[PDB]
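Box 4.2: Ligand-aware structure prediction
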Amino acid sequence: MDVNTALQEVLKTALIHDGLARGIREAAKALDKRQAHLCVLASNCDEPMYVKLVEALCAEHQINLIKVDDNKKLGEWVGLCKVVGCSCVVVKDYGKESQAKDVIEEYF
RNA sequence: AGGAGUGGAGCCUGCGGCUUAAUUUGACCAACACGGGAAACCUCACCCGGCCCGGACACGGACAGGAUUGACAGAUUGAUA
Ligand SMILES: [K+]
Ligand SMILES: [Mg+2]
Ligand SMILES: [Mg+2]
Ligand SMILES: [Mg+2]
Ligand SMILES: [Mg+2]
Ligand SMILES: [Mg+2]
């Protein structure tokens, strides 16, 4: 039960329950709205202001953050599949509690 | 054999012609108050001008580092499209 597998399962559940906000604009709106318990970041993105703003907003809202490696893999996980490639995700809510969610909380 | 008429008058209404941006069009005993057709808009088919897609689905491309949607004001417009 690796943290990668836990993230994949929780993202799949959130998408199936429509609790996922993909993209930097949607993620920023969800974070500023005092919602969206968790956030996922991709280390592949080459834009420095991107990661700077993502981390600054996440820290200001005081919510968990995860830095995954590949933007394309993150997009394929969040369900943009040819994969567009998501470089920042937000979990507005989880559909149902699961062992993957528990593992993510423990990693937090 | 007759009665009431029509054809004459004014008007209503349909048809041709003429005119027009358009005067939408069908029909010439068995067409012409016929299309149940008494049209201000709609009807609308015609003319002038301006929005919209309400172009399914398939394939390909562009895309969450955003494909795309809508919009306040001021110009613009017949118009608060
Ligand atoms: K007469
Ligand atoms: Mg007469
Ligand atoms: Mg006969
Ligand atoms: Mg009338
Ligand atoms: Mg009319
Ligand atoms: Mg009209």
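In the box above, the bound molecule is magnesium ion. The beta strands of chain A are 20-22, 38-42, 64-68, 88-91.
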